[PDB]
Design a binder for this molecule. Structure first.
Ligand SMILES: Nc1ccn([C@H]2C[C@H](O)[C@@H](COP(=O)(O)OP(=O)(O)OP(=O)(O)O)O2)c(=O)n1
Ligand SMILES: [Ca+2]
Ligand SMILES: [Ca+2]
Ligand SMILES: [Ca+2]
Lengths: 419, 1005, 218
DNA sequence: TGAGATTAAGTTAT
DNA sequence: TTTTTTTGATAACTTAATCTCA
């Protein structure tokens, strides 16, 4: 009867159209709207969904690994960066394709995914891939505007643009491996590539084609490589001297490479990629035994337990070196941004983030422990449920608990002065 | 003017709406009073001044404070106080509906606004002055200032009342009368005027009789009238035509009665007589406004109620009469259905349950038996009620199995002397009741004659007077007056609203007295929370005395003690890990000391978090504690009134009223935890439940393993407060007034949400009773604290704890001795459930009694008792399957019809729906019906019961199974067999026996 | 497309095949009332009672329900008369013209728009006096509306208090929309922008939109 | 084709 | 010749249908 219910039903339908790419907030809003509609109007054609299954392969055709003839039209060829794809509808942080759980992101790329995302409404979602602490975009589903326009907007916003081509001649072209190699060489793209996709006017579903070879040769051993601030990655090394790409620790766990054996790794014109298809729970234990006790896997990467002090806090707070508490609190009070950030965040959360501990594992370790706290400061602790001390990562984390509690005490007694 | 006592309040629904009051004077004059009708709004002074169209009227409400009652989750100790704004408020009256956007207190009614604003009680008597009253009509006055007119109050005085108890009887052919083909046959009236003269008269349609029949009737002493003019209400039997009968009914209904009472008359009787009136001659029943301006026609309208769970469906239908003259039309069917919980709600069942007595055999005969009843056979007052109903009764039920016609009746000054036509019976004391009769109405309608017509007239007048008997037995007038006084509502709808509405009157009174307004902005979110605690029973058979200790009004008292109100909730402090939990607990231990604040540790509302503490302030009393305190005071007053009653009817009425007030308090608490309510508070409900759980746990811990020796009683634990330290003695050794020669040990075995069962190693009823009284006195004086009080209910003998909520025992009350007769009580067993069986109840009663006797005499040395039980069970089952002598009434089940189903195509529906589509009678959305399991007669014993719950058919009053249909005895036997085997100790024998004729594995609790 | 036999004056029932589970009960609800109904003259033509029961039903998506025909004059189908001087049809026409932006129109005959069939709750009335035949049509209207709404996505009704017990009259849940004619509301039906509501409800149920432009005469 | 776990509905105690 | 007001909670058991692995 009124307009509020009309607007509510309109927005319910609008969010019902975009359901494949959504998060928990969208799902609960949809459920609330469905309940309200089925209560007010006594019947609604749609029901409540709780699977929250993410599927983007429906927007793409089958993978092409054989020579084929392209159709007449305009072509905008672009490559795809190898790694896990993080799709993102709108208004939140990026979620993971096929997992549903979202991922915390830096505020800069958060600002980018707020501003350049969906210029008005054209793009359903931007496909972001994270590789070696590098967040870069790839082909995205477009319905109203062209992907070239989105690329131009991102370029004028300073985003990292993949090399894009412009092909208009057709001449009944046959796409073969030679053409793919020539195009890849033309694009340079020292970053690893796994496949390409082209943009055609009219058609909505995109086409993905990849050319490579199996080349089942060998594997020799593994090693660790540094990326940034306490960021380590595993790389497999062979007898030739080159390394095969590893997307994450999950890939190594699935491939369960242990010694110099015969495993399937695909070879391309530039790099090589481990097999994506495949004891069990002890692979991580064997890996940590082979690589060193002073290591632990967190999130998508590795990390090393070191010495935590004023240096880590200053690095995480984006400030210079600090010696005494007086000048430290003076510098904290000098900058409004830092003080507002430390006010908006809890002591425990920032103290954990300074040491780069995992989110869930650290919470479980704390929940399986006992502490004694006086004057809002923790000084003694112990572990009650030792049965949880089977994962080597949690033991490595517990090995630095003294440094963690020292950081916690320092944060508490400086925030007491900062009020 | 002068002294006038109010009777009813009613509104006018015309163009210019008015509010009317009907009153009576001391002499007996009816006076109607008219007031203008307004729409009431509450605004702020700024909004009042910003209203560009000046309001018609406005009053200064005064300075009031508005409080936001939203609840937020706090992860730290930085809690911001609630937004309280003090302003000046205006109560404006508008003759039309205005749409002020910033209006507060929008949940109350205009009629309630008038009542509280003018300081006028809905029921009472006032000395009205004539300066504010203008004589509009002869007997109708107008008052433009009801605030000043009703300023004088006087003590209550009794006034005469007019009653019309009516009952019609129609002639049906197949199974139900129709207004288009089936005409009315009898119409019985019990008419009471303002002079106190009671007249009973039945009208018989002469159109159904021939000339010879009319001549015989007029010779026998029946007055035949030809027109409405000559009709006089002095002959108990009047013959007339249908048109004259309908006109007499119209002129009786159009009169300014005080009460027009019928049983299921709004849906059937009034509708039938109206439709007949507008079909035969086409004239309407006209109701006129007291000022003679608005005239309406009678039209029954339907009101539907919705449940608050699931799809919320539809679960109740009621029918009402529209009239603008102050007369109250009452239907006892809806009142009885809503107030009392019984297997069936038919008139015969209600009469059988209500009117019963114990008769002593006086004489015998070849076919007649003489009974006598007085105060010496049954309780005081039962005999008088039986004699009063016997004045018009015709049939009596003996042993709830034999229906016998009354041959001769004699009403004595102290009881009755009834002669019954029943076969000779042994013993000397029997049970008499006024229930079902053994006459089929359709057959006697098919052969209408003189004697049949007179007998049916007698039955109709019996029904008409039975309406009055049920009106007096249920105390409808007293309940109506009390409800009007308490809920602040007109007498016409006191029983028309549920808990969420009846408390709005007192809520508005309290809010205006405290000058408080409560508002909410954020959307309310619903979360599950835990409830009461039930202890698992330690045994199944006791053969020992068990004492029961129960808290008094546990949850309202918890709310009063903790001051749990939505506007007094400081905040909720929650933790995700143990560092934060320890830090915030240490901070909270000192930030909010508990002489004034209270902190309740609840289960976390989210799986992420591990702790949750809700903080409440006990410095200023909340709204919910005050409402609960008022309701508790009313309940205590009516319980005190109950304690001073001698007759059975007074005791029953007062017990029902105090039970209603207890239910009202419980429902107020539940509304505190109801999301759709305006008093929703998740933290308050959680805190109340948690406090109750800790209280019952504390009581059980203290009582369990406690023994008394010499003059001292030793409690298991220290008498320490489970919430915060108190300045009380915590020693568990207490002086005991019992003699030194007493030594017993107590072991807590069971508990339910406020009740604790203590097992005592004693069998003397008197000693156990006095020890229980001593225990309850001690645990009220020392164990409990503040407003928490406990009581000793009764002592249980031969307790059989079947499950965690089911038990059968014999109860000796607090005021009882060993020689006193114990009362067999059941809680949750298959004797109180309405959907098990009648045969199953008898079998389980007999077998439980036999097992109890065997255990008492000393048995269970081996499986001999199990062998005997199995042999008896098999013999009885085989005999009852082969004989097939039990009637269908022993295998009938009852269920309630509704539409609150999560699945649209529920198997429960499509059974009532198909019944309604193939029968003229209709099962309403709250009607209780009957069903039974049936199958074709040519079906042998089935050991694999598959495709069941589809064989059940609805059994109405007129249902006789044919030779091709039979009762599905397997379903009843399987449920009965599974219950008995659970009471035994042998397993392999029970499983092997069960597996034989039932292809399934037994389930053991 | 055949007919049924009733021992009463009309004896003219347009019985379509799709309406098979109606007549076998409808006569039982009408035989006992027709004799008493025909003794009094009625505003609709007595020979015109069942005229909307011949059209196919598995085509429509939304049905508009009227409580009773006009007190004076009647063509059977709701909101159809060559007079164009009323209170309900004129404001509905004005609202639909504002919605669709069409000014020139002569005749609506809403029965002709595909996907919509008008419905009257009570199938008869009296000259001048309205709502005087509820008893004659209660059960018949209940059964007819249950059958109608059994195979319709959304039901549209006019009136708030008039259509108040509809949630209990029919058992199977269905999307029901109730209107609000002005009466004393001072042209409040203009605020009742329910056509867009039913259109977007059909949109949510992946149904073809109903266009308010097929039923026009020029 | 059996056991076993799950879900919906009904009833009572509190 | 057609219009304002509704709506307590959780816990524990039995019986039955329906889907999945073996
Ligand atoms: N229908 C009910 C019955 C009970 N309770 C809750 C609140 C009561 O405080 C508690 C105990 O139930 P009782 O039946 O013992 O009721 P009271 O303790 O309030 O009453 P009494 O004065 O008879 O002891 O259970 C409830 O919420 N709803
Ligand atoms: Ca009767
Ligand atoms: Ca009757
Ligand atoms: Ca109690």
């Amino acid at each position: 009867t009124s307009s509020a219910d009309l607007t509510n039903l309109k927005e319910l339908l609008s969010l019902y159209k975009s359901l494949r790419f959504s998060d928990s907030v969208a799902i609960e809003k949809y459920n609330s709207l469905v309940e309200w509609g089925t209560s007010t109007y006594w019947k609604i054609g749609v029901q409540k969904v709780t699977n929250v299954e993410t599927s983007i392969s429906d927007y793409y055709d089958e993978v092409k690994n054989k020579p084929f003839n392209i159709d007449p039209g305009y072509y905008i060829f672009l490559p795809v960066y190898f790694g896990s794809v993080f799709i993102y509808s709108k208004g939140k942080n990026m979620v993971e394709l096929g997992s549903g759980n979202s991922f915390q992101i830096p505020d800069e790329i958060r600002s980018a995914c707020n501003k350049v995302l969906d210029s008005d409404n054209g793009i359903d979602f931007l496909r972001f891939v994270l590789l070696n602490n590098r967040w870069i975009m790839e082909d995205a589903i477009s319905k109203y505007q062209s992907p070239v326009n989105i690329f131009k907007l991102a370029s004028e916003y300073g985003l990292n643009i993949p090399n894009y081509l412009e092909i208009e001649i057709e001449e009944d072209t046959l796409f073969d491996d030679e053409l793919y190699s020539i195009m890849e060489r033309s694009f340079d793209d020292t970053f690893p590539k796994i496949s390409i996709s082209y943009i055609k006017l009219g058609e909505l579903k995109r086409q993905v084609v990849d050319f490579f070879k199996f080349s089942f040769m060998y594997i020799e051993s593994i090693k660790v490589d540094r990326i940034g601030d306490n960021i380590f990655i595993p790389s497999v090394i062979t007898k030739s001297g080159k390394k095969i790409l590893v997307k994450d620790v999950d890939h190594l766990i699935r491939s369960k490479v242990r010694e110099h054996t015969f495993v399937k790794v695909k070879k391309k014109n530039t790099f090589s990629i481990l097999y994506d298809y495949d004891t069990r729970g002890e692979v991580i234990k064997r890996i940590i035994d082979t690589i060193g006790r002073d290591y632990y896997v967190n999130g998508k990467y590795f990390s090393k337990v070191g010495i935590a002090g004023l240096k880590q806090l200053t690095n995480k707070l984006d400030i210079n070196e600090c010696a005494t508490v007086d000048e430290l609190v003076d510098e904290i009070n000098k900058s409004g941004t830092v003080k507002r950030k430390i006010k908006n965040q809890s002591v425990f959360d920032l103290s954990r983030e300074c040491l780069g501990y995992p989110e869930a594992d650290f919470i479980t370790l704390v929940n399986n422990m006992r502490f004694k706290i006086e004057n809002c400061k923790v000084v003694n602790f112990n572990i009650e449920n030792t049965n949880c001390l089977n994962n080597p990562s949690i033991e490595t984390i517990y090995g630095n608990f003294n440094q963690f509690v020292s950081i916690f005490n320092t944060v508490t007694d400086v925030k007491k002065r900062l009020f | 003017g002068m002294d006038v006592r109010c009777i009813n309040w009613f509104e006018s629904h015309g163009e210019n709406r008015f509010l009317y009051l009907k009153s009576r004077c001391r002499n007996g004059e009816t006076v109607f009073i008219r007031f203008p009708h307004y729409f009431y709004y509450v605004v702020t002074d700024e909004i009042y001044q910003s209203l560009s169209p000046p309001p018609f009227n406005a009053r200064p409400m005064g300075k009031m404070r508005t409080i936001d009652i939203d609840e937020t989750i706090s992860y730290n100790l930085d809690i911001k106080d609630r937004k309280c704004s003090v302003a000046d408020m205006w109560l404006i009256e508008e003759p039309k509906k205005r749409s002020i956007q910033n209006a507060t207190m929008d949940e109350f009614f205009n009629i309630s606004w008038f009542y509280i604003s003018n300081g006028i009680s809905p029921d009472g008597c006032y000395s009205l002055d004539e300066q504010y009253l203008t004589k509009i009509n002869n007997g109708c006055y107008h008052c433009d200032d009801p605030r000043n007119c009703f300023a004088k109050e006087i003590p209550r005085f009794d006034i005469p009342r007019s009653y019309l108890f009516l009952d019609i009887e129609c002639h049906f052919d197949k199974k139900f009368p129709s207004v288009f083909i089936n005409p009315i046959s009898h119409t019985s009236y019990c008419y009471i005027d303002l002079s106190g003269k009671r007249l009973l008269f039945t009208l018989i349609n002469e159109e159904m009789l021939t000339e010879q029949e009319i001549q015989e009737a007029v010779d026998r002493g029946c007055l035949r009238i030809q027109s409405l003019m000559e009709m006089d209400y002095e002959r108990e039997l009047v013959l007339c035509s249908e048109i004259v009968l309908l006109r007499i009914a119209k002129q009786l209904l159009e009169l300014t009665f005080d009460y027009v009472v019928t049983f299921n008359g709004h849906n059937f009787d009034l509708r039938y007589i109206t439709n007949r009136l507008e079909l035969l001659t086409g004239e309407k029943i006209i109701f006129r406004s007291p000022d003679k301006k608005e005239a309406v026609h009678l039209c029954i309208y339907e009101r539907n109620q919705s449940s608050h769970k699931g799809v919320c469906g539809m679960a109740n239908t009621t029918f009402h009469v529209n009239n603008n003259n102050g007369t109250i039309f009452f239907d006892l069917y809806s009142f009885i259905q809503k107030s009392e919980k019984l297997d069936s709600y038919k008139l015969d069942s209600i009469s059988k349950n209500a009117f019963s007595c114990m008769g002593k055999v006086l004489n015998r005969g070849v076919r007649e038996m003489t009974f006598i009843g007085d105060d010496t056979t049954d309780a005081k007052g039962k005999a008088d009620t039986f004699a009063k109903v016997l004045t018009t009764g015709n049939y009596v039920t003996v042993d709830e199995d034999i229906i016998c016609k009354v041959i001769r009746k004699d009403i004595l000054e102290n009881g009755f002397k009834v002669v019954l036509s029943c076969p000779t019976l042994p013993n000397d004391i029997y049970k008499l009741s006024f229930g079902k009769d053994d006459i089929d109405l359709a057959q006697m309608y098919k052969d209408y004659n003189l004697n049949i017509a007179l007998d049916m007239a007698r039955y109709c007048i019996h029904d008409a007077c039975l309406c009055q008997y049920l009106w007096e037995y249920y105390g409808v007038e007293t309940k109506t007056d009390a409800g009007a006084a308490t809920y602040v509502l007109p007498q016409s709808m006191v029983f028309e609203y549920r808990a969420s509405t009846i408390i709005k009157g007192p809520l508005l009174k309290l809010l205006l007295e405290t000058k408080t307004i409560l508002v909410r902005s954020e959307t309310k979110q619903k979360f599950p929370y835990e409830g009461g605690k039930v202890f698992a029973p330690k045994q199944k058979m006791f053969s020992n005395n068990v004492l029961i200790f129960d808290y008094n009004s546990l949850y309202p008292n918890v709310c009063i003690f903790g001051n749990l109100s939505p506007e007094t909730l400081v905040g909720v402090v929650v933790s995700t890990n143990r560092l934060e939990e320890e830090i915030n607990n240490q901070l909270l231990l000192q930030k909010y000391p508990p002489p004034r604040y209270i902190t309740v540790h609840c289960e976390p509302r989210l799986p992420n978090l591990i702790s949750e503490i809700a903080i409440f302030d006990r410095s200023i009393e909340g709204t919910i504690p005050r409402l609960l305190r008022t309701f508790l005071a009313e309940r205590a007053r009516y319980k005190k009134m109950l304690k001073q009653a001698t007759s059975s009817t007074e005791k029953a009425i007062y017990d029902s009223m105090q039970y209603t007030y207890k239910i009202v308090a419980n429902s107020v608490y539940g509304l505190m935890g109801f999301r759709n309510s305006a008093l929703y508070s998740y933290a308050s409900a959680k805190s109340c439940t948690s406090i109750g759980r800790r209280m019952i746990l504390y009581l059980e811990s203290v009582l369990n393993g406690a023994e008394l020796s010499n003059g001292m009683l030793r409690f298991a634990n220290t008498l320490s407060n489970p919430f915060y330290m108190d300045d009380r003695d915590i020693n568990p050794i207490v002086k005991t007034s019992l003699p030194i020669d007493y030594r017993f040990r107590f072991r807590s075995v069971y508990g339910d949400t406020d009740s604790v069962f203590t097992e005592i190693d004693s069998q003397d009823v008197d000693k156990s009773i006095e020890i229980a009284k001593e225990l309850e006195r001690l645990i009220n004086s020392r164990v409990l604290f503040n407003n928490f009080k406990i009581e000793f209910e009764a002592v249980y003998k031969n307790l059989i704890m079947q499950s965690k909520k089911k038990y059968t025992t014999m109860k000796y009350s607090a005021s009882s001795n060993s020689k006193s007769v114990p009362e067999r009580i059941n809680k949750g067993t298959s004797e109180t459930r309405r959907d098990v069986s009648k045969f199953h109840k008898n079998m389980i009663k007999t077998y439980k009694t036999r097992l109890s006797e065997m255990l008492s005499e000393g048995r269970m040395n081996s499986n001999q008792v199990c062998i005997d039980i199995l042999r008896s069970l098999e013999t009885d089952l085989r005999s009852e399957f082969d004989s097939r002598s039990s009637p269908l009434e022993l295998f009938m089940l009852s269920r309630m019809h509704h539409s609150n189903y999560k699945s649209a195509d529920n198997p429960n529906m499509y059974l009532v729906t198909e019944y309604n589509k193939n029968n003229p009678e209709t099962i309403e959305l709250g009607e209780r019906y009957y069903f039974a399991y049936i199958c074709p007669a040519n079906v042998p014993w089935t050991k694999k019961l598959v495709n069941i719950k589809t064989y059940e058919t609805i059994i109405d009053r007129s249902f006789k199974l044919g030779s091709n249909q039979r009762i599905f005895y397997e379903v009843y036997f399987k449920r009965l067999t599974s219950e008995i085997v659970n009471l035994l100790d042998n397993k392999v024998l029970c499983i092997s026996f069960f597996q034989r004729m039932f292809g399934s594995r037994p389930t053991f609790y | 497309m055949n007919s049924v036999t009733i021992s009463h004056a009309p004896y003219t029932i347009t019985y379509h095949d799709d309406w098979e589970p109606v007549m076998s009960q409808l006569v039982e609800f009408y035989n006992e009332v027709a004799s008493w109904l025909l003794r009094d003259e009625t505003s609709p033509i007595p020979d015109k009672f069942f005229i909307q029961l011949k059209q196919p039903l598995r085509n429509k998506r939304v049905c508009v329900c009227g409580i009773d025909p006009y007190p004076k004059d009647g063509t059977g189908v709701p909101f159809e008369s060559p007079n164009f001087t009323k209170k309900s049809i004129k404001e509905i026409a004005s609202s639909i013209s504002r919605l669709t932006g069409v000014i020139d129109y002569k005749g609506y005959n809403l029965n002709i728009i595909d996907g919509v069939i008008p419905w009257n709750y009570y199938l008869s009335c009296k000259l001048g006096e309205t709502k005087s035949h509820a008893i004659y049509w209660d059960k018949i209207s209940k059964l007819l509306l249950q059958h109608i709404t059994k195979h319709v996505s959304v039901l549209y009704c006019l009136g708030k208090t008039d259509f108040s017990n509809i949630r209990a009259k029919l058992e199977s849940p269905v999307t029901t929309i109730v209107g609000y004619h002005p009466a004393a509301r001072d042209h409040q039906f203009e605020k009742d922008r329910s056509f867009e509501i039913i259109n977007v409800l059909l949109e949510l149920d992946n149904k073809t939109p109903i266009n308010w432009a097929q039923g026009f005469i020029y």
